[PDB]
Amino acid sequence: DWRCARSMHEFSAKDIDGHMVNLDKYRGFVCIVTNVASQCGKTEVNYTQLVDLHARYAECGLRILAFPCNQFGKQEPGSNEEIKEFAAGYNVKFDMFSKICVNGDDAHPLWKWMKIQPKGKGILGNAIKWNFTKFLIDKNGCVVKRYGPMEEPLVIEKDLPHYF
Numbered sequence: 557d558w559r560c561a562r563s564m565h566e567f568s569a570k571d572i573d574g575h576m577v578n579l580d581k582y583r584g585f586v587c588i589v590t591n592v593a594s595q596c597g598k599t600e601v602n603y604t605q606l607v608d609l610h611a612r613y614a615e616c617g618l619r620i621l622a623f624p625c626n627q628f629g630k631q632e633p634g635s636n637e638e639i640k641e642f643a644a645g646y647n648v649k650f651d652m653f654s655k656i657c658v659n660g661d662d663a664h665p666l667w668k669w670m671k672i673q674p675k676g677k678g679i680l681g682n683a684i685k686w687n688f689t690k691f692l693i694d695k696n697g698c699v700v701k702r703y704g705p706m707e708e709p710l711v712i713e714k715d716l717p718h719y720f
Contacts (some may be wrong), residue, residue, distance in 0.1 A: 558665035559672070559708030562606045567666040571624070571654040579666070579673070584695050585619045586720075590668065591658050592622045593631040593687035594642045598705065602688045605709035610650045611677060616720045620650035623667070625658050628687045643677040658684045673699035686710075693717075 559565065564587070567582040593599060607698070611619050615640050622623055624639045626632040632639065636654050656664040669690050671682040676699040678685065686705035694700050701715055 558669045561669050563672075564666060564693050565697040565701075567669065569621075569656075569664065569666060570654040572624075572636050572643075572654055574654065575638075577651075577653075579621075582619055582621075582693070583697065585617045585620055586695055586716060587619045588709070589621045589666070589691045589693055590683060590709075591625040591628075591667075591687060591689055592635060592643075593625065594629060594639060595631040596629070596687040598688055599631075601708055603643070603648065607647055609709055609713065610648075613716065613720055614649075616716075618716070618720070620678045621653060622648070622650065622715040623653045623658070624655040625657055625684075625687070626655060627657055627684075631687055634672070635655075657658070658689075670699055670702075676702050677704065678702065679704065 567579045569577055569579065571577050573592045590598050598611055610618060632655060640652060658667040670676045678689060688705050688713060690703040691699055692701045692715055703712060
C-alpha cells in the first residue's frame with residue numbers, strides 16, 4: 557500500500573503517451589516532481605524555468621517528472637495529446653506524464669505518498685494548493701523539500717547537491 561512505501565521508486569505512473577513507467581528508473585537521480593497546467597497565470601515561468609534547469613543539470617543527473625492536473629481552476633482541460641504538444645512548444649525534453657488528480661481519494665498514489673513525507677509537508681496543511689507545486693526528490697527517492705505554487709523553479713537550484 558502507498559502509505560507503507562519509503563521511496564518514490566516504489567511507484568509507477570503512466571507517461572503522457574500511455575507507457576507505464578516504473579519510477580525505479582529514477583533511482584540514482586535527483587528529481588523535481590511537479591503538477592502542471594497549461595492555462596495558469598504561472599504556466600510560462602514554470603515551464604521556461606523547468607526547461608532551463610533541465611538543460612543545465614540533466615548531465616549531472618537532474619530529472620523532471622511533470623504531472624498534468626485539472627483540479628485547480630480547470631486549468632488543464634486538454635487531452636494528453638494536446639498537453640504533450642503544449643509542452644513541446646516550450647521545448648520540454650523532460651518526462652511528461654498522463655493527467656492525474658493530486659488531491660482527494662482519487663489522487664495518484666505517488667502524490668498521496670509525497671504529501672505525507674516529513675519534508676513533503678505543506679506550509680498550511682499537506683493538500684496541494686494550486687498548479688505548480690514542486691517536490692525535490694533525492695537519489696534514493698526520498699522527499700527533501702517542497703516548493704509551493706508561487707515559488708519559481710529557479711529557487712530550487714540552490715538546493716541541488718553541491719556536486720551539481
